[PDB]
Structure formats: structure tokens, C-alpha cells
Design an enzyme around this catalytic site. Structure first.
Site, PDB file in Angstrom:
ATOM      1  N   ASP A 117     -12.492  21.145  70.072  1.00 22.65           N
ATOM      2  CA  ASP A 117     -13.298  21.924  71.005  1.00 22.65           C
ATOM      3  C   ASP A 117     -12.487  23.025  71.684  1.00 22.65           C
ATOM      4  OD1 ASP A 117     -15.743  22.581  72.182  1.00 22.65           O
ATOM      5  OD2 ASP A 117     -15.332  21.361  73.971  1.00 22.65           O
TER       6      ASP A 117
ATOM      7  N   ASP B  61      -8.855  19.506  78.214  1.00 20.36           N
ATOM      8  CA  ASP B  61     -10.143  18.946  77.801  1.00 20.36           C
ATOM      9  C   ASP B  61     -10.087  18.254  76.452  1.00 20.36           C
ATOM     10  OD1 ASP B  61     -12.736  18.166  77.778  1.00 20.36           O
ATOM     11  OD2 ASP B  61     -13.563  20.141  78.276  1.00 20.36           O
TER      12      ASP B  61
ATOM     13  N   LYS C 282     -11.620  26.581  72.866  1.00 19.30           N
ATOM     14  CA  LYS C 282     -12.396  27.744  73.284  1.00 19.30           C
ATOM     15  C   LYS C 282     -11.783  28.257  74.586  1.00 19.30           C
ATOM     16  CE  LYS C 282     -15.773  24.727  75.493  1.00 19.30           C
ATOM     17  NZ  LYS C 282     -17.221  24.409  75.664  1.00 19.30           N
TER      18      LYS C 282
ATOM     19  N   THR D  42      -9.408  -1.662  43.541  1.00 16.63           N
ATOM     20  CA  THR D  42     -10.089  -1.161  42.356  1.00 16.63           C
ATOM     21  C   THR D  42     -11.536  -0.810  42.690  1.00 16.63           C
ATOM     22  OG1 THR D  42     -10.914  -1.744  40.156  1.00 16.63           O
ATOM     23  CG2 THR D  42     -10.519  -3.547  41.697  1.00 16.63           C
TER      24      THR D  42
ATOM     25  N   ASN E 261     -11.266  26.262  77.671  1.00 16.46           N
ATOM     26  CA  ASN E 261     -10.384  25.100  77.568  1.00 16.46           C
ATOM     27  C   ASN E 261      -8.919  25.500  77.528  1.00 16.46           C
ATOM     28  OD1 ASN E 261     -12.215  22.990  77.739  1.00 16.46           O
ATOM     29  ND2 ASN E 261     -12.538  22.857  75.515  1.00 16.46           N
TER      30      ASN E 261
HETATM   31  N1  RU9 Z   1     -12.383  20.743  81.392  1.00 20.27           N
HETATM   32  C1  RU9 Z   1     -10.965  20.594  81.662  1.00 20.27           C
HETATM   33  O1  RU9 Z   1     -10.337  19.760  81.097  1.00 20.27           O
HETATM   34  C2  RU9 Z   1     -10.317  21.393  82.791  1.00 20.27           C
HETATM   35  C3  RU9 Z   1      -9.057  20.852  83.452  1.00 20.27           C
HETATM   36  C4  RU9 Z   1      -8.501  21.519  84.436  1.00 20.27           C
HETATM   37  C5  RU9 Z   1      -9.117  22.833  84.918  1.00 20.27           C
HETATM   38  N2  RU9 Z   1      -8.713  23.787  85.996  1.00 20.27           N
HETATM   39  C6  RU9 Z   1      -9.563  24.749  86.020  1.00 20.27           C
HETATM   40  C7  RU9 Z   1      -9.500  25.938  86.976  1.00 20.27           C
HETATM   41  C8  RU9 Z   1      -8.158  26.284  87.611  1.00 20.27           C
HETATM   42  C9  RU9 Z   1      -8.066  27.293  88.445  1.00 20.27           C
HETATM   43  C10 RU9 Z   1      -9.302  28.122  88.787  1.00 20.27           C
HETATM   44  O2  RU9 Z   1      -9.178  29.202  89.672  1.00 20.27           O
HETATM   45  C11 RU9 Z   1      -8.508  28.794  90.833  1.00 20.27           C
HETATM   46  C12 RU9 Z   1      -9.292  28.189  91.997  1.00 20.27           C
HETATM   47  C13 RU9 Z   1      -8.665  27.801  93.088  1.00 20.27           C
HETATM   48  C14 RU9 Z   1      -7.150  27.957  93.191  1.00 20.27           C
HETATM   49  C15 RU9 Z   1      -6.473  28.478  92.190  1.00 20.27           C
HETATM   50  O3  RU9 Z   1      -5.084  28.612  92.283  1.00 20.27           O
HETATM   51  C16 RU9 Z   1      -7.201  28.929  90.925  1.00 20.27           C
HETATM   52  C17 RU9 Z   1     -10.464  27.823  88.240  1.00 20.27           C
HETATM   53  C18 RU9 Z   1     -10.573  26.647  87.268  1.00 20.27           C
HETATM   54  N3  RU9 Z   1     -10.529  24.504  84.995  1.00 20.27           N
HETATM   55  C19 RU9 Z   1     -10.203  23.301  84.352  1.00 20.27           C
HETATM   56  C20 RU9 Z   1     -10.851  22.524  83.205  1.00 20.27           C
END
Ligand code: RU9
Ligand code: RU9
Lengths: 282, 282
Positions: B119, B140, B121, B157, B124
Site C-alpha cells: 500500500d 502504515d 502511496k 508427488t 504513507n
Molecule cells: N497511517 C500511518 O501509519 C501514519 C503514521 C504516522 C503519521 N504522521 C502523520 C503526520 C505528521 C505530521 C503532520 O503535520 C504536522 C502536524 C503537527 C506537528 C508537526 O510537526 C507536523 C501531519 C501528519 N501522518 C501519519 C500516518
């Protein structure tokens, strides 16, 4: 040594890995299959046997998880179908029909319930008596598969999906057809007394024989067999899974439209049921 | 409400299902993914994250199994790669190279360890900072597969074995190639700012585009991209799995023989390592 808990309910006897045993409480015979320690294969079999209820499928009575894996089952006094056919022995047609009709009922039931046996063969088919007119039961669900992710992938947009997965959609859901192949090979053997695919007196490799679907046909032998019976075999030994006969199609074949055979089956079924049956409200 | 044990170690904050949180002990930021209750998918992910150790693969810090499924992970301050490319935004080539080189290292590591992501993308793929020069980490693993029965069937066999199983031998062991497809699609997007396969201004169905392998090629857009970069994409978007580039073949491509990019990567890796590194015996 046998686990204490086992010895507490059963008296272990001769080897038949499967050995004969008696239930202390009832003094009845049971078969106990032993497997040294693949938990998942055993777990799958235990999972499967507990949930199934069908006359042509063997019943579990108990299970013990100790130094080894002990599985208690019904005893079939007829032994394995394999012993009837080994060494070119051949069953008479009507006997083949009676056994096969029951094999179909069993595998149909399995398939209806999302289970694929995956290892059908004469040694996995048990006879309920030393009589040639008797009940058969399927056994050995170690290799079985239970019926997904493809469904889950199809619900999403395949923007990133590799093409081999999309293509695989066209062939998905025909896994159970492997059981129908094995059935055809069993029927071929039963009817003729010899395997359709073999490395006996042939230049072509076993794999090649099977993939091409060219079973070894010996007229002299088959001359004693009906064209209906052979026809059904030809329809099960189809190389293409989509086109291959399903259990249902098999059970509708003219070879199985034999009202005598079905009657004799009801009888044997009734006899087994009797002595296990409570009085009915009428 | 959040489970008591969670609140005991963490202060939950804003949503990013993934929300920001602080570790009471250290006052550090963490990301916590929440999944309502598919134990196996969660179990597989937990199983996978605990055993993996790689700079371009995200690390688990804690896990809680309660009213819901709470998974604690490193926080990547750069967010998702998806946000960099959405709406036709396009990364400059050298940035694509730096990110992709790391994506390859990660997926190679996965593949070397018998794990298939399944998956991949842009959402991820996480960026370690708001700088465009930064470390990426894959995340993920819900849909991942761990690498059999075919091997087991081949040891016996195939007297009763259906032909479709034998044939399947010729294509077995190329499952990991699906990850290399997804990678190619990611690289296409990163380099051009638009998907190779889409239902935008085309009569041909998405499925048909993908199976035929005919991605939408727009010269004007690609004119700004090197022939080396495009070449690598062409080698990953190969319809035939056997022929498709593996991660290793990708990492040997002339487009990734860029000693500057690798240097900048060592740097970023070193900076992250620093402050986490014990003094060395010399
Ligand atoms: N589905 C997953 O497995 C997965 C696992 C871990 C993940 N961390 C984010 C993520 C990180 C930072 C983001 O902006 C920010 C928001 C607040 C503070 C900052 O420093 C950055 C937005 C999303 N998305 C994730 C997805
Ligand atoms: N692998 C299985 O899942 C399985 C499960 C149950 C099985 N029972 C026999 C079996 C039954 C009867 C035999 O003759 C006898 C021996 C003693 C008494 C008797 O009445 C018949 C020989 C083998 N084979 C079995 C295999």
C-alpha cells in the site's frame, strides 16, 4: 509416554500416525491421530472439525494439546479407501458410484461452507465398514483453507495498484476447483484400478501430463466401464478451472441419476443414525 | 474518552486517524494512530514495527489495546509526502531523487526481510521536517504481507494435484514486485506533478490503462525532466512482474548514481543520529 489426561479417558491400543483406542466410560472404539510439534495446521483442523456436521465428514470427539498433538475421532471399521484400490485392485462400477456420490455430497458441503480440502486422495477417504456397501467419510483437514483482501482492494481506486492484481481478478474464486480435480483423479482410479497420471512406461514427465491434461487411457481396461462414468471423469479432469465441473454439476450428471444407489445410501445412513436417535414428537 | 493508561503517559492533542500527543516523562511530541475495532491487521502492523530497524522506516514507541486501538509512533514534522504533490505541485528533480533513494532503501530492506508493504502511496511516506532537504520514512503496515504451502506441495508427488497449482509455480515469488509498481507511480507523480493513470480527459478506463501499462505522457510537462529520471520510471512501470525492476536494479540505475545526493543523505542521517548516540570506544 501418553499424556496423563489422555490415559485418564482412553486406553491406547494398536497403530492403524493413527492408533486404535477405547473410551473408558463407554468401552467404545475411537481413532486417535497423533501429530508431533505446526500449531496453525492443527488449529485449523480442530477449528474445522468442531464446526462441521455431515454424515460423510468425520467427527471429532476430543482433543489433547500436550507433549504432542492428540486428536480423537470416530473409528471407521472399513479403513482407508486406499487399501481397496492399491495394487491395481478395482472396485465394481456400482460401488464406485455409491462411494463417489458420498464424496461429492461431502465436498459440496465443504465448499458451501467456505472450506477447501486441498488434499483429497484415497487415503483420506474412510469406509464405515468391511462391507463394500457402506458409508464413506472424508478426513484430514490439516491442509484445508478457509475462505478477502482482493475484495478490499477492489473497493478502493487502483491509482497505485499493480496490474497483476487487477488481472488476478479474472481468475479469483475458483480455488475450490482444485478439490474437483482431485475428485476426478480418485474416480479414475476407482473405476480403472490405475492412476491417470504416472511415470509408468511414459516419456512425458508427470508435470507435463497433468498440465496438458492428457491422462493415460487404456481401452482394454475402460472397456468394462460405462460411457456415462467415463464421461463424468472427462468433465472433472478439465485443465481449465472455470470450465471444470463443480460438485453441483457433478451431482447432476446422468451417471449419478441412479435411484437404486441413492436408496441404498439412505438405508446405510438410516442404520448408522439408528441407536443414536431420540424418539420423535409426532 | 481516551483509555486511562494512555492518559497516564501521554497528553493527547490535535488531530493530524492520527493525532499529536506529548510524552509526559520527556515532553516530546509523538504521533498516535487510532483504529476502531480487524485485530489481525493491527496485530500484523504491531508485529512488523517491533522487529524492524531502519532510518527510512518509522518506529513504534508504544501500543495500547483498549476500547480502540492506539498506536504510538515517532512524529515526523514534515507531514505526508502527499501534501507536497497534491494539486499539481511538483518537486524539483534533485528533491525527487533524494526522497526516492530513501524510499528504495526502505522497501529494499522490507523485501530483504520478507515483508511486502502492498500500500505504498504518497500519504504513507512521511517527511522528517518542513525543509525540502530532509529524511523520509515509510509508514502504515496494516496491509503488509509476510513471506509457504506451494513449497510444501512441491515436496510431494502431484498425483492428485490440480494443474493450475503446478502452473502457478512459474509466477510464484514475485509478490514483492507490486511494491515496485507503486514506487514507479509515486516517482512519476513526484517528477511530473500528475498521475500516470487517471480518469481525467480519457476514454480508456483506469483498469485498462493500468493493465496495458499505457500511462498518460505529456511532453510539455516531462520536457523539464531528465531522460535518466524518466528512464527509471519506464523500467518500474513494466506490466510484466518478472521483467519489472527490483529495488536493487533501481538502486543501480544511472539516475541514482549521484554522489551529491547520497552525501546530503548521510548528512541528514547523521544529524538525526546525533543526540541519540552514545560515545564510541576508540
Ligand atoms: N497511517 C500511518 O501509519 C501514519 C503514521 C504516522 C503519521 N504522521 C502523520 C503526520 C505528521 C505530521 C503532520 O503535520 C504536522 C502536524 C503537527 C506537528 C508537526 O510537526 C507536523 C501531519 C501528519 N501522518 C501519519 C500516518
Ligand atoms: N489422517 C486422518 O485424518 C485419519 C483419521 C482417521 C483414520 N482412521 C483410519 C483407519 C481406520 C480403520 C483401519 O482399519 C481398522 C483397524 C482396526 C479396527 C478396525 O475396525 C479397522 C485403518 C485406518 N485412518 C485414518 C486417518
Amino acid at each position: 509416554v501418553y499424556p496423563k489426561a489422555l490415559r485418564d479417558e482412553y486406553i491406547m491400543s494398536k497403530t492403524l500416525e493413527v492408533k486404535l483406542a477405547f473410551e473408558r466410560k463407554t468401552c467404545k472404539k475411537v481413532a486417535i491421530k497423533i501429530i508431533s510439534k505446526p500449531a496453525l495446521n492443527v488449529e485449523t483442523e480442530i477449528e474445522i472439525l468442531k464446526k462441521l456436521n455431515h454424515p460423510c465428514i468425520i467427527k471429532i470427539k476430543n482433543f489433547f494439546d500436550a507433549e504432542d498433538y492428540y486428536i480423537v475421532l470416530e473409528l471407521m471399521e472399513g479403513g482407508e479407501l486406499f487399501d481397496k484400490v492399491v495394487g491395481n485392485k478395482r472396485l465394481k462400477e456400482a460401488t464406485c458410484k455409491l462411494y463417489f456420490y458420498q464424496m461429492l455430497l461431502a465436498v459440496q458441503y465443504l465448499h458451501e461452507n467456505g472450506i477447501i480440502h486441498r488434499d483429497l486422495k484415497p487415503e483420506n477417504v474412510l469406509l464405515s465398514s468391511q462391507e463394500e456397501d457402506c458409508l464413506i467419510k472424508i478426513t484430514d483437514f490439516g491442509h484445508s483453507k478457509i475462505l478477502t483482501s482482493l475484495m478490499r482492494t477492489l473497493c478502493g481506486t487502483p491509482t497505485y495498484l499493480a496490474p497483476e492484481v487487477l488481472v488476478s481478478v479474472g481468475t479469483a474464486g475458483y480455488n475450490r476447483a482444485v478439490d474437483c480435480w482431485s475428485l476426478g483423479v480418485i474416480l479414475f482410479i476407482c473405476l480403472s484400478g490405475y492412476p491417470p497420471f504416472s511415470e509408468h512406461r511414459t516419456q512425458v514427465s508427470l508435470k507435463d501430463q497433468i498440465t496438458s491434461g492428457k491422462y493415460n487411457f487404456i481401452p482394454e481396461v475402460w472397456a468394462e466401464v460405462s460411457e456415462k462414468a467415463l464421461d463424468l471423469v472427462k468433465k472433472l479432469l478439465v485443465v481449465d478451472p472455470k470450465a471444470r465441473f463443480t460438485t453441483e454439476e457433478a451431482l447432476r450428471h446422468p451417471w449419478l441419476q441412479d435411484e437404486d444407489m441413492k436408496r441404498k445410501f439412505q438405508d446405510l445412513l438410516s442404520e448408522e443414525n439408528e441407536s443414536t436417535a431420540l424418539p420423535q414428537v409426532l
